[PDB]
């Protein structure tokens, strides 16, 4: 089976600058190479067929070249909407095979998160669960540090973080940080804090 | 051109995964019609296609467990994948030959586990939270299986300022949250409701976000 090797695995680019993504085939595939853009949400969009032919309604800043084994996808003057996964596919030899993808991140100015903390809902506390939820919205860059504290003391156990994809307009991320406790543990402590690296939100169970 | 992919989101190990793709804005008897799947790790696999004339090609990784048929009179085609295992858990897509047209994915889970509907908890601000020009509300969706759930706010009429976070697996069940930010002046005066749909348990739950007691 033809193996397609894509590089780089990840790329960051500032809007207005260029990118060139590489796809190399383990054997010749002639010009039978497609390029796709996929956001982590939706379905892939076809950008290029036969290695270098433009698809109806694809902006002209996308172009492809290559024949044989070595191909490139270029995006001249990258836009904030260009973030996401870029995959090549060969249609020369059955079975058709995909590359592993290049993840394109759009670079922008540092932005502090807006932080919101939510105590467990009265409905949850009846089922013996106590999730303390912290939303860190519209920040950059992706790799933010979130500390939990309970009654002053750092807390790592029972913390799970989840990130949205990049925003297509402003290039920010959002993340949830959830501290899952039992009602038993929750009721034995007064104060709960989540802090972004410091931007801090806190509440007291007795208030 | 549009695909409607239909069939189970949950299949038991050793049973048959059967999907249907309904095609509009293109005849099945021109072009080729494909099935593609995406594994949880992001790897895409081309499963097979059926030609305008009924000819089939199958990915040899599937080793003759796969069948693709078509019904030209209905503008539909079918995937039957026999003897499924947890390795068949993936997002399945129907697409034309070159993937110019590429349907919305369908997440299919192969598991012996029972379907569990989600518990939905509204997240109103703490009694004593700092006030601002905007307020963030949330909705915690806990203890469902399998993925996915779809979260909407005011049945989709509130779409701006929404962040729905990817689900995380804890003790064989999924959890996710969704946040919505609205102007402070407008809540609670203009109500905000999360709506959570879980196709696998054929369940939808609406919870109004109410200020805390
Ligand atoms: Cl750059
Ligand atoms: Cl606990
Ligand atoms: Cl604290
Ligand atoms: Cl039609
Ligand atoms: Cl299995
Ligand atoms: Cl989900
Ligand atoms: Cl509603």
Numbering used by the authors:
A (entry chain L): 1 to 197, 204 to 213
B (entry chain H): 2 to 214
What does the study report here?
The greatest discrimination between self and foreign was achieved by antibodies combining four mutations (Hy104X)—L4F, Y33H, S56N, and Y58F—yielding 1/KD = 5.4 × 105 M−1 against self and 1.04 × 109 M−1 affinity against foreign, representing a 1,900-fold difference. Given the unique L4F, Y33H, S56N, and Y58F mutation trajectories induced by FlexR101D, we next used crystallography to understand the structural basis for how these four mutations combined to convert an antibody with nearly identical affinity for self and foreign into one with 1,900-fold self-foreign discrimination. We solved the structure of the quadruply mutated Hy10 (Hy104X) alone and in complex with FlexR101D in a Fab format. Comparison of the Fab components of the Hy104X-FlexR101D and Hy10-RigidR101D complexes to the Fab-only structure of Hy104X show that, in the absence of antigen, Hy104X CDRH1 broadly resembles the conformation observed in the rigid complex (with the exception of minor CDR adjustments to accommodate the L4F mutation and altered W34 conformation). Taken together, the Hy104X mutations enable the antibody to adopt different conformations, retaining essentially the WT structure of the founder antibody in the absence of antigen, while allowing for structural adjustments and picomolar affinity binding in the presence of the antigen. In the results here, the quadruple mutant antibody became dramatically more specific for foreign over self, through 19-fold loss of self-affinity and 67-fold gain of foreign affinity.
Here we address this question from biophysical, structural, and immunological perspectives using structurally related lysozyme proteins. To understand the conformational basis for selection or counterselection of cross-reactivity against foreign and self-antigens during antibody hypermutation in germinal centers, we used a mouse model where the cross-reacting foreign and self-antigens are well-defined lysozyme proteins. To investigate the impact of conformational flexibility of foreign antigen on antibodies that cross-react with self, we analyzed mice to track and sequence HyHEL10 (Hy10)-derived antibodies on single B cells responding to four structurally similar lysozyme proteins. The results show germinal centers have remarkable ability to select antibody producing cells along novel hypermutation trajectories, transmuting an antibody with no capacity to differentiate foreign from self into highly foreign-specific antibody derivatives, exploiting conformational flexibility in antigen and antibody.
